[PDB]
Structures are given as structure tokens and as C-alpha cells.
Nucleic acid binder design. Structure first.
Ligand SMILES: [Mg+2]
Ligand SMILES: [Mg+2]
Ligand SMILES: [Mg+2]
Ligand SMILES: [Mg+2]
Ligand SMILES: [Mg+2]
Ligand SMILES: [Mg+2]
Ligand SMILES: [Zn+2]
Ligand SMILES: [Zn+2]
Lengths: 103, 343, 132, 218
RNA sequence: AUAUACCGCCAUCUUCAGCAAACCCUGAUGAAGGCUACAAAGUAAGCGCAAGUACCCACGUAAAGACGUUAGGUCAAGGUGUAGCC
């Protein structure tokens, strides 16, 4: 559904809870410190890559300016600076789509 | 021959070769292991090639209030039964051999970011579901003996905590990994230190100390920052309940002594009510988000002091060249400010 | 070091029965014999046949009452009469139990041309002598 | 809730069981509690409790002695009124008979014989799963024969059990909650401490009895 | 063929007596150690030794004699894993 009622839908609640979406995701990468810029994308030619980011694996979610309570979980409530893609675990494409959407 | 045939457990022992030359010394083998399988439990007693109908064990004895009679299971019937049994054995084998997914902690094939779940209930009855566990390290200690020689003795380090400022570290030694985990978890839940925290997410002030050639320097840090510290300290703070700080370790890296000094400092830190009632002055807090506004933290419970502190100028205080460098900004290193994973 | 009809001492995770626990040199001092016949005594004969047939009987009955027994059997051969005694568990149905009883009885009788009969004693779970 | 009120009532009152009348500096000096070992037997943490020295012999401050003794008696009496278990220790064999006898007379228990390893720590395995370890420990002689700190003070500080010991110039009052400076070695002092503890615990017991009778009436 | 996969069965120290699940403590909570009886941190399931049983006794002789070393011997008592002849 293009609207944002899928978030209030209780399948979202049981699938996540009161935690954010990025909290569950974990990156497979080289040893120690990971790379400093995430993958280019999680979807290619209508095909999904293994271990994709959460907002991409959950196709029912929609990144848009209107989903305020979905967008606000990334940017800290205590500091206005938006978290980085290596932080939230998402690929750079959807990361910058989200940053322009929140702008 | 039939007289030469014998029981099953003997054959299973002879096939598995659990002990005698290869199991001992720890030499073992090249990761080849034959999995035990129970065949008698699987098939019903009546199954066979000739599928006679048995009202005694294979078929219900009575039907429609009428005694049954011996009958025949013909070719395609016994073939269907054999196919069903083949499918059932294949299903049992699939369910037998599968993956095992223990959550990846600090690294694969490492017991660092692994949690054993809460401690076990006590004998008199003591439930500790609020406590969460963590395995900091595991090592295969070896000490020799006269007749058997080298003995493998697993040593493990563990921590436990609520997330409410209470936690405890402990070691555990045993010949078996699970038994060592259990010993360590139990005596850990029994041995615990409490530490205060300022606003549920930070320490009261920075703490610099040394312990067995392990210099450690933790720095308080306000909200929206995270935990950029040694991964052991990160897990320990996850257990404690503080959400953000900074820390650095210098010199030797022995995480046992690291944890011991960590808890020592976090216990010896003074609270602000403590310090105020000790000195005899009002504490005053200042933020960057808030302007020039004095925020009182804690006041003396006893009688306040009359005179204020005289201005201490050019104090004799031993400071750190590295933090002075990082404050002056001339310091440069690619390895300092990295955009690591979440917290 | 002798290994002959004895249990290896474990951590304490091995339920053992009276017979499986005690040693073979304790057999006459603190056990009885699983069979009772006179072929072994002086003057008699067919002891080899007695032993072969009773071993075959033990194997056949263990495999035709599989998963229900929890201990060795007791054979009691009085002249012509042959008596068996077993201890089993209440796993399967008494229908199956009696059916297999009659089946084994008829087979043994027709095979050995001998009057055979058996008794079975039920137990909820196999008795244990110690945990070695 | 009124049961909790009865449990809490004696706390607000100071010297509520009249423990002060039992002891006086006259009696202490007569029982020779003020003595101490030589300066060679002196201890740092005991120094501030030393009123002075004479002939290289240590002397105890009787005002501090009386303060700590009052506090100890008050605590013991509150615990007895709460029916809290009390356990005596005196490793010195010179008075084991008398101490066991007065323990029998009180109803509170004692252990003067050799102390076993982990008797308190592994008490669950020793005795059984469910066992009520004592609520208060006291020491007529804090040190053993070889003059090390008795393992009981350490075990009590570990397992959160309060301890009240008579500390001599050789003793370590750091672990003790209510250290009473005195003369561990003198028979007059031992007998006097025993009689004071008898009177205190018996008064607490009979007072609980009378209060319970009054509440049963009401 | 593999005793260097094993079971089963034995030599060995053993003409020893220790082996030890489970708890606690000390060592700054390291590998590790835990003995002082006019006693100072050790407590111990269980096994073994022992005791009792066999011969003529209570002694003696037999029997028993654990954990483990010798990758000790035995796929040739028998079976069986792996590799081969089929
Ligand atoms: Mg890996
Ligand atoms: Mg021999
Ligand atoms: Mg070999
Ligand atoms: Mg013997
Ligand atoms: Mg012999
Ligand atoms: Mg060899
Ligand atoms: Zn993506
Ligand atoms: Zn003295």
C-alpha cells in the first residue's frame, strides 16, 4: 500500500516492536572495521541481492516525505544530524533518496 | 549367520569409534563424524516384504463389531507402503541434518558477542530472567600431568547485567565448554558489582586509570553519540544500561584485567550528590543546547558551606598529550574518525 | 585391567541394572544364572545343544519383543517343561503383547517339539541399580 | 501492616531497651578491658583507638569503647527483638566451655571449635538446600590461635551478614561493622561481655514476648 | 589393506592407591593451588583400594586391582567403518 497505514498495521509492530527498523539489520563485510560507504543498491533489474537492507527487503514499506514517523527514527531526536548509511545499514541509493525525501 | 549376528549398540560403537586411540590426545580426525541413527523406533513392527494384514498389531483388531481375518497386501499396495516409508525416512534424515544458526557476535567462529540467556533458577528458588549474559572470551588452556600428559581445560570469561546499573564479571574453568559456561554464569550471577550512572546513559565524569599495565581512559559524552569503545566495553555497557560514552585502552590488551579495572573505576567514581554533600557547595550544570543557564544537579543534604571555593589557577594536574593533541587539532590520523557500524 | 561383562565408570550418567552392574566373577556369589538346566552337571549330555537353543531363543524373543524388554531373561527347564520369564515395559498395547506371546509360544513349541510357556512382568520404567 | 509497625517502632527511639545501664567505665576498668598488647603487637587501624602507651604497652580509649559497646548492645538487642539468629565465635579454647554454656542459656548459638573451610559459603551443600544462615555474627576473639583474621569475618562481609567483634591491638577492625576495642584475652573481660550479652538478648526476647502478648490482648 | 576407524578380549605400571562429577576459597578473579588437629579453607556424590565372599580360620593363598601412558597386541575368534576384487 502506497499510504503509510502499513506502519500502524500490527504486523509491523510484531515484526519490529518499539525498536527502530535499522536496529535488527547487520552487515556482512570484511574483518574489523567495515567499509566507509555502503553498497550501491540492494535491488538490480528487479532482482534483490542477498542480505539486503531492511527498507529494501520490506517492499511493502514506501519511503516518502509523508511517512514522518518512519523517517524520523533515523535522524536522532536529540541531535538534528541524520545518521550515516554505514550506521543505519542501508545502501547509498535509498539512503540519499531518504535524505532528499526528508529534506 | 544369525548366530553371528548380534545387538545394535555394539555395531554402533564399532562404527563410531568413540574412543581408544583417536579420541584421546585431542588428535581426533579430519572433521568426519558418523551421526547416530535409531532404526528400531522408526518403522512399525508389522512392516515387512510380505504385507500380510495383521489384526493384532498392524490393523485394528475389531471393525464394525466384527472379528478380522488374515489378508494380503498386494503388489502395488506394498509398493505404495514402501514409497511412503522411503519418503518418511528421507523426511527424518532431512530434519536430522540441517543448519545451525547461532547469532554472529563479534565474529564468526568466535564466542565474543554470544549470550547464554539469563542464569538458571536457584535451588531454593531464585529467578534471574532480568539478567542477560555475555561471553567475553574463551580459551583452550593446557596443563600437563604425569600419566595422561597434556589436558585441555576450557577457561571462559563472562559478564551478566540487568541494564539498570547492576552487573558482574566472572571466570569459569572446566573440562567441558557447556559446563564451564554454566559454572561461570552461576557464580557470575552470584558475584555482582553495582555502579551508579548520571542520567541513565552516561558515567558521572571521565575516568583514567591503570591496572596491570593496562591503561584505560573513559570519557563522558552527551546524548546522540553512541558507544565508541572496545567491543568488550560495548557489550558490558549494553548489559549495564548506559547508551553512550567514549573510551580508549593503551598498553597491554588482556580483557580480564580490562574488565576488572573497568568495574573498579566505575565503582570508585563519585556521584554528584556524594560530592556535593562532601564539599558543601551547589553543583551547577551547563549544556551547549541550553544557553548560559545554571542547571543545579544536586545540593548538599547537610548544612551548606558559607564561603565559596577560592579560584584555583594554573593547577598542578597531569594531563594527556594525546587528548591535548586532539583538542589543539594538529593531530591527524585516518584511523581516528571512522564511520563504523551502529554503536 | 580386565574388560569382561562390566560397565565403564562414567561421570554418573549411565543407569545400570543389577546384572549389568555386577561383575562376572560375582556371578555365583551375588547373582544367579540366566538358565537352569542339568546338561552341565556330571553324567548328563546335550549341554551344547541346550546352550545353542537357549541362545537362539533369547535372540529370537528379544527381536520379536523389541523395545519392550529392559533386562536379561530367566529360563527354567523342569524336565520336559520349558518356562520363560521376562520383564518388559508398557510401551505397546496388551493386544499386541498377547498376540506376540501366543505367536512365540506356538513357534517355540512347534520348533522344539517341547511344552513351552512364558510369563512377562510389567514395569513403568526399567529399574536401575546405580547411576555410574 | 501493624506487624511492620511493631517491627519498626523500636527504631525511632534511642536507647529504647535501656542497654546503657548495663555497662560503665568503672566496670570496664575493673574487668581490665583497657589493657593492650605491646607496641610490637600494635596495629595501624587500631592506633586511633589507642588512648596512649605506657611501658611499651597499649591502652584503649574508654569513651570510644563505651560508644562502640553501646552501639553493639543496641544492635544485638534490636536483632533479638526481631528474633534474628545470633552466632558467637571464640576460637580461644580458654573460654569455650563458658561460651557454649552461656550460648545454651541465651538460646542463641555459638561455634568455638575449629572453623571449617567454607562452612558458611557452601552451607547449602553442607546442610541442605533450604537453610536459614544466621542474621548476626559476633566475635569474643577475632583472631585464631596463629593470629590471622578468622575466616568468619571475611565470609560475613562477603555474604552480607553483619559482624560485631571485640578488636584487640592485633585485630583488624576494617571488616568489622561494630568493632569494640577491648581486652580479648582477660577472663574478667570475657565473663563481663558474656554477662552483658546474656542480659541484652534475654531482655530483648522477653520484651518481644510481652509485646506479642499485649497485641494478642488487643 | 587399514589394530593409525573400532567393538569385543587382554599385557603394562598394579608386589600402586589413588581417580573424581558437583560446590567454595586463595592467588589484585593468570596459567594453577587448597596440607598442617594443642589445627591456618577446604566440603565431597560416586568408583577404586579396603571390608565381606571362595579354599582350611579372623591369617594366608586366590580373586579383585579404577583414571590413564605405551596411536601396546589382535580387521586371522567373530562382526563392523573406509578403500578394493566383484
Ligand atoms: Mg566468517
Ligand atoms: Mg590379569
Ligand atoms: Mg593399536
Ligand atoms: Mg581387597
Ligand atoms: Mg590374579
Ligand atoms: Mg602400537
Ligand atoms: Zn537497499
Ligand atoms: Zn589479645
Amino acid at each position: 500500500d502506497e499510504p503509510w497505514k502499513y506502519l500502524e498495521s500490527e504486523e509491523y509492530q510484531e515484526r519490529y516492536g518499539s525498536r527502530p527498523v535499522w536496529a535488527d539489520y547487520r552487515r556482512n563485510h570484511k574483518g574489523g572495521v567495515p567499509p566507509q560507504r555502503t553498497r550501491k543498491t540492494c535491488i538490480r533489474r528487479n532482482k534483490v541481492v542477498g542480505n539486503p537492507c531492511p527498507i529494501c527487503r520490506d517492499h511493502k514499506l514506501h519511503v516518502d516525505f509523508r511517512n514522518v514517523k518512519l523517517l524520523e527514527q533515523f535522524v536522532c531526536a536529540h541531535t538534528g544530524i541524520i545518521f550515516y548509511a554505514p550506521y543505519t545499514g542501508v545502501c547509498v541509493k535509498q539512503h540519499k533518496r531518504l535524505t532528499q525525501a526528508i529534506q | 549367520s544369525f548366530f553371528t549376528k548380534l545387538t545394535a549398540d555394539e555395531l554402533w560403537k564399532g562404527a563410531l569409534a568413540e574412543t581408544g586411540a583417536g579420541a584421546k590426545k585431542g588428535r581426533g580426525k579430519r572433521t568426519k563424524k558418523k551421526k547416530r541413527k535409531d532404526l528400531n523406533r522408526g518403522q512399525i513392527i508389522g512392516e515387512g516384504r510380505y504385507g500380510f494384514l495383521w489384526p493384532g498389531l498392524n490393523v485394528p483388531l475389531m471393525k464394525n463389531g466384527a472379528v478380522q481375518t488374515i489378508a494380503q497386501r498386494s503388489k502395488e499396495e506394498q509398493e505404495k507402503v514402501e514409497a511412503d516409508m522411503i519418503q518418511q525416512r528421507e523426511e527424518w534424515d532431512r530434519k536430522k541434518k540441517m543448519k545451525v544458526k547461532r547469532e554472529r557476535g563479534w565474529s564468526g567462529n568466535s564466542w565474543g558477542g554470544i549470550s547464554l540467556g539469563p542464569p538458571d533458577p536457584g535451588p531454593c528458588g531464585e529467578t534471574y530472567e532480568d539478567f542477560d549474559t555475555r561471553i567475553l572470551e574463551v580459551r583452550n588452556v593446557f596443563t600437563m600431568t604425569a600419566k595422561e600428559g597434556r589436558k585441555k581445560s576450557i577457561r571462559v570469561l563472562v559478564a551478566v547485567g540487568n541494564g539498570k546499573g547492576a552487573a558482574g564479571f566472572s571466570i569459569g574453568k572446566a573440562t567441558d565448554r557447556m559446563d564451564a559456561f554454566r559454572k561461570a554464569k552461576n557464580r557470575a550471577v552470584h558475584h555482582l558489582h553495582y555502579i551508579e550512572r548520571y542520567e541513565d546513559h552516561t558515567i558521572f565524569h571521565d575516568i583514567s586509570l591503570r591496572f596491570k599495565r593496562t591503561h584505560i581512559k573513559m570519557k563522558k559524552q552527551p546524548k546522540g553519540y553512541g558507544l565508541r569503545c572496545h567491543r568488550a566495553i560495548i557489550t558490558i555497557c549494553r548489559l549495564i544500561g548506559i547508551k553512550d560514552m567514549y573510551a580508549k585502552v593503551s598498553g597491554s590488551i588482556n580483557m580480564l584485567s580490562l574488565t576488572q579495572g573497568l568495574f573498579r573505576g566505575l565503582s570508585r567514581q563519585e556521584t554528584h550528590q556524594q560530592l556535593a554533600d562532601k564539599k558543601g557547595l551547589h553543583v551547577v550544570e551547563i549544556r551547549e543546547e541550553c544557553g548560559p543557564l545554571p542547571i543545579v544537579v544536586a545540593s548538599p543534604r547537610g548544612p551548606l558551606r558559607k564561603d565559596p571555593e577560592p579560584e584555583d589557577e594554573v593547577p598542578d594536574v597531569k594531563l594527556d598529550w594525546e587528548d591535548v593533541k586532539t583538542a589543539q587539532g594538529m593531530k591527524r590520523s585516518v584511523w581516528s574518525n571512522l564511520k563504523r557500524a551502529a554503536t | 585391567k580386565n574388560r569382561a561383562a562390566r560397565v565403564r565408570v562414567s561421570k554418573g550418567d549411565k543407569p545400570v541394572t543389577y546384572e549389568e552392574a555386577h561383575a562376572p566373577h560375582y556371578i555365583a556369589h551375588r547373582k544367579g544364572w540366566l538358565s537352569l538346566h542339568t546338561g552341565n552337571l556330571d553324567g548328563e549330555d546335550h549341554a551344547a545343544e541346550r546352550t545353542v537353543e537357549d541362545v537362539f531363543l533369547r535372540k529370537f524373543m528379544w527381536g520379536t519383543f523389541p523395545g519392550c524388554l529392559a533386562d536379561q531373561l530367566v529360563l527354567k527347564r523342569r524336565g520336559n517343561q520349558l518356562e520363560i520369564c521376562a520383564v518388559v515395559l508398557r510401551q505397546l498395547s496388551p493386544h499386541k503383547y498377547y498376540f506376540l506371546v501366543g505367536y512365540s509360544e506356538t513357534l517355540l513349541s512347534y520348533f522344539y517339539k517341547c511344552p513351552v510357556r512364558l510369563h512377562l512382568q510389567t514395569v513403568p520404567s526399567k529399574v536401575v541399580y546405580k547411576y555410574l | 501492616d501493624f506487624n511492620d509497625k511493631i517491627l519498626n517502632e523500636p527504631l525511632k527511639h534511642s536507647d529504647f531497651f535501656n542497654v546503657k545501664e548495663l555497662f560503665s567505665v568503672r566496670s570496664l576498668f575493673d574487668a581490665r578491658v583497657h589493657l593492650g598488647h605491646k607496641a610490637g603487637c600494635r596495629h595501624r587501624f587500631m592506633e586511633p583507638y589507642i588512648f596512649g602507651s605506657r611501658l611499651d604497652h597499649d591502652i584503649i580509649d574508654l569513651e570510644q569503647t563505651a560508644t562502640h559497646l553501646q552501639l553493639a548492645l543496641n544492635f544485638t538487642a534490636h536483632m533479638a527483638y526481631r528474633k534474628g539468629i545470633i552466632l558467637f565465635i571464640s576460637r580461644n579454647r580458654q573460654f569455650s566451655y563458658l561460651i557454649e554454656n552461656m550460648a545454651r542459656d541465651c538460646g542463641e548459638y555459638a561455634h568455638t571449635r575449629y572453623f571449617r573451610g567454607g562452612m558458611l559459603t557452601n552451607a547449602r551443600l553442607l546442610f541442605g538446600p533450604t537453610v536459614r544462615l544466621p542474621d548476626l555474627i559476633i566475635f569474643l576473639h577475632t583472631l585464631n590461635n596463629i593470629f590471622e583474621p578468622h575466616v568468619a569475618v571475611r565470609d560475613a562481609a562477603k555474604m552480607n551478614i553483619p559482624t560485631v567483634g571485640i578488636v584487640d591491638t592485633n585485630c583488624n577492625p576494617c571488616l568489622i561493622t561494630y568493632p569494640v576495642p577491648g581486652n580479648d584475652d582477660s577472663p574478667l573481660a570475657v565473663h563481663l561481655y558474656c554477662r552483658l550479652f546474656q542480659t541484652a538478648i534475654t531482655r530483648a526476647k522477653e520484651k518481644r514476648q510481652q509485646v506479642e502478648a499485649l497485641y494478642r490482648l488487643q
